[PDB]
Each structure stands twice: as C-alpha cells, then as structure tokens.
Write a protein that binds this ligand. Structure first.
Ligand code: ZN
Lengths: 157, 122, 115, 193, 267
C-alpha cells in the first residue's frame, strides 16, 4: 500500500506477458547477486481402526457370503459376555466412504421372532436406532445392540 | 542383603537429584566472608556428590553381579524360623505401641485439662 | 546521542524506502517496455542497485547504533547491580577473583565426577 | 458502621404506596431475603439555623442531632429530655415530624429496609435503604451495592450519595446514614404534592 | 531502566525484520511467476505473495517508527565476570525451577525447637515488606506467638503460631472487636458475617496448602503474600462469571500461585 504502491502498479500492469519473468530477472538478479552473493549452497483402514479398538465382548468378523474387496463391506459380529445372554449374530453393511455417512443394520425379523425375549431385544434395538444421531459409527450400533440386550434382560426381570 | 542393596541404590539416585537441586540453589543465591562460606558449601556439596556417584557405581556392580525369571511373569493375574522371629517382634511392638498409646492419651488429657483450667481463670 | 541518532536515521530510512520502491518500478517498467514491443525514453533512469545498497547501509547504521546503546544500557544496569579509587580496585579484584573461584570450583568438580 | 445507601423509590405512576411496597418486598422475598423485624426512623426539626433530631431503630439507645451542614452529635436517648428542658430557646416546630416504618430483610450481610414515608397521617413516598455489613470504607464496595440494587431495584437505581463523594480512605460512620436520611426527608417535604 | 533495554532489543529485531523483509520482496520478485497448474491459480499465488511481502515491509517500518516514538535514553576481565555471573544466575534459576518441580524424593527416612527471638526476627522481616500489612506479635500464652495482621481497612487476621509454623487463622472484619473484655486477643471467635467465615475457611486451606516440610520462612512469607491479595476484596469481580455477587457473596477465593478472584462455587 503506502510506500510500496508503484511496484505493485508496475507488476500488476505487466502480468500475462510471456517475457515477464525475463523482465524481473534482468531488472533484479544482478543487484541481488552482487549484494547477497551467489544463490543457495482392500478393506478401508477406518474400519480396521474401529475393529482394532473394540471391546472383547464383540467378535466382529467378515461374512463368508456377500461381495468382498469391493465398495461396501459386510460384517457378522457376535456377542460374548457372562452378564448378557446368547443372541442372534447381527449383520452389518458398511458402505464405502464410511465416515460422513451411517452404516446399515441388515434386519432379520424372522429370527427375532419365536421368543418373547428376542422380540424385546428387537423392539428396544429399533427404538435406540431411531434415537441415534446421524453419521454414527459402527461402534455406536454395536453398543446400542449391547445396551438393548441389557434392557431386554432387565425389563423381562 | 542384596534386596536391601537395591533399596540403597534407589536412595542414591534419589539423593543425587536432590543434591543437584541444592547445588543449583546455591549457585542461584551467590552474589559475586559469606563469599568464602558459600564457596566452602559449594565445594563440600560437590565432594559429597562425587562420593555418591562412586557409591552408586559400587551398588550397581554389587547388584548386577548377583536373571533366570523374566519380568511380566511375576504379576499375579486372576486366571521358617524367621517367620517365628517376625511374629515375635510383631507381638513385642504390638505391646509397645499399646503402651505408647496410653502414654500419649494421658499427655493429651493433661494438656487439654491445663488449657481448659487456665482458660477459665480470666 | 544514540536516541537522537536513531531519530536522525528514521526519516532517511523512509526516504531510502521510497526511492528504492519508485526506482524499482521505473527500472521494471523500462525493462518491460524493451522486452515487450514498446517505445520508451532512455532518460535519467537512475540505477536500482545503488538505492538497494544505500538502504542496506542505512540499516547497518541503525543496527549499529542500537546495538551500541543496548550494550551501554545493559552495561550500566549490571554496573549499578555491583569512594577512594583503590577501594574500587580492591572490590573489583575481589569480584573477579570470586567469580574465578566459583568457575574453577565447578570445573574441577564436574571433572572430578568423571575424567 | 457498614456502608449504606439510601434512596427514594418513586411512586410507580399508579396504585398506592402500599402496593409498590408490596412489589418491592415481594421481589425481596423472591431473592431469598428473610424478615428479621421491623424498623422505624424518626426525624423532627428544631429552630430558634435548623437542627434535626433523628432516631433509628437499629441504634435504639442513640439519638442523632444533625446540623444540616455542620457536625453531627450522637448521644444517648436523654438528649430528647434536654430538648424538653430547652423548650424556650429551641421550639419544637410541629407539623414536621416525619417517620419511615417498615420491615427489615437480611440477605447474606445485606440489610434492606423498605419504608413508607409518613408525614402525619398521609404516606408520601418510599424510602429504600441498603446496608452492606462487612465493608467499612465508602466508595470501595460501592459496585457491590450497585449490583445488588440493579438486581432488585432494576430501574430507578440510585448512584453515589455525596457522603461517598468525599474521596479518600475515610471510614464510613453512622452519622452518614442519618445525613442521607435527612436529605431524603427534605426532598420528600419539598416534593409534597 | 529495564523498559529501555526491552525497547532497544525490540527495535533491534525490528531493523533486522525490516531488512530481511525488503530482501524477501526482491528475492521473490527475482524468481518470477511459478507454474501452479491452473493459470488463474498461478496468477493468484504470485499476486498474494507479493502483496503479503509488501505488507510485512510496511508493518516492520511502522513498528520501527513506533519504537522511535517510545524510545528513551583488565577492565574486560570485570565485564567477563559480570556477564558470567548473570549467566550463572539465570541458568541456576531455570535449573532449580525445573528440578524442584520434579523431585524423586519419596520419604525423608533412609536405609521444631526454636528461640522466640528468631521468630520475632522472621516476622518483623515479613512486616518490613508489604507496607499495607501491619503485623503485631504478642505472646499471651507461652512461646506460641499470636499475630494480629491488619490489612488495609479490610481485614484483621488473627494468626496463632506454634514454634514458627502457622497453626490457626481467624479472619474478622475491620470494625469487629478482636479483643476480649480484658484486652487480650480473642483467639476463639467467629465474625458474624458470611464473607469472613468463608475467608477463614480459605485461610485454613491456605495454611494446609503452603507446606514446605523443613524451612518455615518460605511458608509464612508465602502465606502473607497470598493474604496480601485480599486487599482487593469488594472490588475484584469473579474471573469465571464476571459478576461480583453469587448468593450475596463477593469472590472470596484468591487462588494459590495465581492470585485471582473467584467465588468458591466457581471453584
Ligand atoms: Zn463466580
């Protein structure tokens, strides 16, 4: 701005000439080189990060079935915990570009029938799924699953 | 023996750091007879520190002379006349501690009575 | 004097900056008018390089004056930190000897630890 | 001798003085103040220059004699008897007895006394007095009093009585409260309507 | 004075910055426009760098001018010893601070008796500094010294020592009678107000907090340093909520090691 303007006017006047840097060189390099001397002397890794940090309750493994080494990935988890009862395995479909979007829980209504207890597990799980914020992780789904199993143990007894 | 040599070796490293801190405080306070006194204190501290280093190398060599069990095999996860000597001295200072508690209680009560009686005289 | 030399050197510094920027713009415009196809008067073009070294000479004078004044004032501060002239020389040799004693005590015992 | 501040709460432009007093004491009962008794302040003027004789409830054994710009006397209650013993040199100057009556609320070392200024039968204004116990130096805890008055007065918040305006480290005294009360009473007598 | 030292070192760095920024302007102009994929992007980059360099030169010149507005005005063996003394003093200060922050001492064990004259000398030494605090020692009950520390027109603190180590403190207000009927110190009382009972509690945490094991002079000096900060009661606002009053209390908490005001509810 002040005390520097005519340089700025000269250089902004003379941009887009192909001989521009020639002009700068010819007008500036002999002074500088006299004073200053001569010049100088398969699976996306976000999911591996999630699975590597899970609690040893969960036992997440890939589905033998379904497409592999391609966009989306598919998981069959498990649940081991003395406090919690054995439950249906749970099926997850993680999209490619996994963060910035929410994974999907593959619903299997037919195995969550044939007991009152698994029905309570399923109702409570769909409730906490509706309660979830958007763009949640895989671990949010797995933890809502474990909390759903715990509530269905407590509500029953 | 050697399992007290380890304790002495820990105490030497704990003393060396504290002694260097005291040396740096002496060098902080020294303002260009007390000149000579601070000189003597500095030289004596440095002498004692060199003694501590020699003692530390001695204790290191003694404990490093006298391992078949690696560590992390030593932690319990979930899933004979010297014992009688210990029990003897334990019973002895049990009785000594109870007698010391009686002496301490009587001193406390005498102090409290003196302060109460002298507080009320005014 | 160093404050007043500093007040002397400031407007000269602004003048050298003004001349340096304007002369840089003049030389660049002349070289672009030769490099692109343009007529331009030769004239009193007033070389750039002299202005650049003149600015550097003024900055050397400024940093020289300020380093001198800062050394002088730090000097006076530690001198006040520490009336017959032989009494002055006695306490001065006392101070020099005492600092020598601290230094040799530290060196001899830091060598007495190892080697 | 804690720092106090005395002010006039205005009429409110509507309703009775009693209803505005109900509003202020209601706000005080919101904030957590507790009633701890009642208070009365009496002022009379005596003339041959004017002298004032004042009584607080808070200092029940004391009577204050205020000479409007001159010095204040504090004395025991027998001073009143001396005025009855004077009786010819200093006439009583009746129809200028003035009182404030009200309840005193305490809210954590703040004493708030809200009274109704009653010249004879008719009540003609609201006096509000806030005393801050701990502070003993005027103009230092003034901002505390300002925040408390901004908390419950809101608008009509007074500012800096001139007894504070003597700007030193002067220790506040009990005479300054009666000075402020005398200034308030003179303003209400001149307000009249 | 030290402000001239700091202003001169400041303006030294200002000249070095001005010179280097001018040379940086001309060096970046020497190289010329770079390539930068997009043509629009390369024009933008060159213009931005040139403008930033020019602005930095202007800022450095302005700072030099501002310092100009604010500026004010065998023998080598002695100066060498002076420089080496200041160097050793600063070096020892830093190393002592770093080492006593992290001590490895775990226990005093390996493998109180004082003349009252010494206590009076120590406490008079503390009373000589802090000109707004007056400390008046007395010994009504034996060797245990009792101190009245008045503080401005604000506080009266009754400190009850035991062998040159603070034991109990009671903070009362200025007007409050700290004397009994017989004119002795009222060692056992409270202060009729909420504020000063809170400050007694904070003073008891202060004497529980400033505990060196051996040397007691730093303890009493640091306790009086902390106590001196209470002179801005009724004037300092809380550094968390901004206001003066929480539940009708001023900020009674002067925090240790950084004497800042807080309401104790605001921790
Ligand atoms: Zn607060």
């Amino acid at each position: 701005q002040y005390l520097c303007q005519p340089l700025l006017d000269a250089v902004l006047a003379n941009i887009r000439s192909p001989v521009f840097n020639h002009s700068l060189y010819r007008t500036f390099v002999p002074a500088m080189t006299a004073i200053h001397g001569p010049p100088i002397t398969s699976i996306p890794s976000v999911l591996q990060g999630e699975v590597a940090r899970l609690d040893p309750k969960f036992l997440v493994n890939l589905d033998p079935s379904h497409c592999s080494n391609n966009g989306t990935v598919h998981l069959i988890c498990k649940l081991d915990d003395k406090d919690l009862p054995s439950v249906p395995p749970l099926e997850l479909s993680v999209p490619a570009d996994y963060p910035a979007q929410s994974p999907l829980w593959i619903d299997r209504q037919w195995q969550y029938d044939a007991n009152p207890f698994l029905q309570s597990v399923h109702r409570c799980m769909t409730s906490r799924l509706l309660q979830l914020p958007d763009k949640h992780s895989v671990t949010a789904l797995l933890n809502t699953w474990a909390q759903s199993v715990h509530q269905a143990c407590l509500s029953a007894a | 023996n050697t399992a007290s040599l380890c304790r002495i070796g820990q105490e030497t490293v704990q003393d060396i750091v504290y002694r260097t801190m005291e040396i740096f405080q002496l060098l902080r306070n020294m303002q260009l007879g007390t000149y000579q006194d601070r000189l003597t204190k500095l030289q004596d501290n440095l002498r004692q520190l060199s003694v501590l280093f020699r003692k530390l190398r001695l204790v290191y060599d003694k404990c490093n002379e006298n391992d078949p069990i690696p560590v992390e095999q030593l932690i319990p996860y979930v899933e004979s006349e010297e014992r009688r000597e210990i029990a003897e001295v334990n019973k002895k200072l049990k009785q000594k501690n109870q007698q010391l508690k009686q002496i301490m209680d009587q001193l406390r009560n005498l102090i409290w009575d003196i302060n109460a009686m002298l507080a009320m005289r005014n | 004097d160093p404050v007043q030399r500093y007040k002397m050197l400031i407007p000269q510094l602004k003048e050298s900056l003004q001349t340096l920027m304007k002369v840089a713009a003049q030389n660049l415009i002349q070289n672009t008018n030769i490099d692109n196809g343009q007529k331009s008067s030769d004239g009193p073009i007033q070389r750039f390089d002299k202005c650049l070294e003149e600015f550097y000479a003024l900055c050397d004078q400024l940093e020289l004056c300020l380093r001198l004044a800062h050394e002088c004032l730090s000097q006076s501060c530690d001198s006040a930190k520490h009336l017959p002239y032989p009494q002055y020389l006695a306490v001065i040799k006392a101070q020099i000897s005492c600092a020598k004693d601290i230094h040799t005590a530290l060196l001899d015992c830091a060598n007495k630890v190892t080697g | 001798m804690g720092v106090t501040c005395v002010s006039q709460m205005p009429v409110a432009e509507g309703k009775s003085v009693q209803q505005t007093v109900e509003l202020l004491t209601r706000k005080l009962e919101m904030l957590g103040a507790e009633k701890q008794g009642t208070f009365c302040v009496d002022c009379e003027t005596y003339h041959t220059k004017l002298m004032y004789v004042m009584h607080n409830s808070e200092y029940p054994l004391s009577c204050f004699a205020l000479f409007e710009n001159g010095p204040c006397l504090i004395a025991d209650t027998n001073f009143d008897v001396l005025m009855v013993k004077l009786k010819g040199f200093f006439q009583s100057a009746k129809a200028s007895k003035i009182e404030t009556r009200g309840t005193r609320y305490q809210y954590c070392d703040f004493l708030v006394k809200v009274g109704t200024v009653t010249m004879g039968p008719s009540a003609r204004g609201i006096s509000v007095e806030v005393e801050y116990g701990p502070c003993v130096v005027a103009s230092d805890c003034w901002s505390l009093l300002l925040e408390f008055l901004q908390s419950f007065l809101g608008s009509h918040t007074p500012g800096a009585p001139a007894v504070f305006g003597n700007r030193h480290d002067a220790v506040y005294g009990p005479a300054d409260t009666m000075v402020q009360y005398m200034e308030l009473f003179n303003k209400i007598r001149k307000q009249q309507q | 004075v030290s402000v001239n030292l700091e202003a001169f070192s400041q303006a030294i760095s200002a000249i070095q910055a001005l010179r280097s920024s001018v040379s940086r302007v001309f060096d970046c102009l020497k190289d010329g426009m770079r390539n930068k994929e997009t043509l629009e992007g390369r024009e933008k980059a060159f213009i931005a760098h040139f403008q930033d360099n020019l602005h930095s030169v202007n800022r450095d010149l302005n700072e030099l001018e501002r310092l100009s507005n604010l500026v004010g005005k065998l023998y080598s063996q002695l100066l060498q010893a002076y420089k080496w003394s200041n160097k050793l003093q600063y070096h020892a200060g830093l190393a002592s601070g770093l080492l006593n922050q992290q001590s490895l001492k775990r226990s005093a064990n390996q493998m109180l008796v004082l003349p009252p004259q010494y206590v009076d000398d120590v406490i008079s030494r503390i009373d000589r500094m802090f000109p707004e605090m007056s400390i008046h020692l007395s010994r009504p009950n034996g060797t245990s010294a009792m101190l009245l520390v008045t503080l401005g027109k604000v506080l009266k603190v009754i400190v009850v020592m035991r062998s040159l180590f603070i034991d109990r403190t009671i903070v009362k207000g200025y007007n409050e009678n700290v004397y009994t009927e017989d004119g002795k110190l009222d060692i056992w009382s409270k202060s009729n107000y909420q504020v000063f009972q809170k400050v007694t509690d904070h003073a008891t945490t202060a004497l529980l907090h400033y505990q060196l094991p051996q040397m007691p002079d730093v303890v009493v000096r640091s306790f009086m340093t902390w106590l001196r900060s209470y002179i801005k009661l009724f004037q300092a606002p809380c550094q968390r909520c901004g206001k003066f009053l929480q539940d009708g209390l001023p900020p009674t908490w002067r925090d240790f090691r950084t004497l800042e005001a807080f309401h104790d509810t605001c921790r």
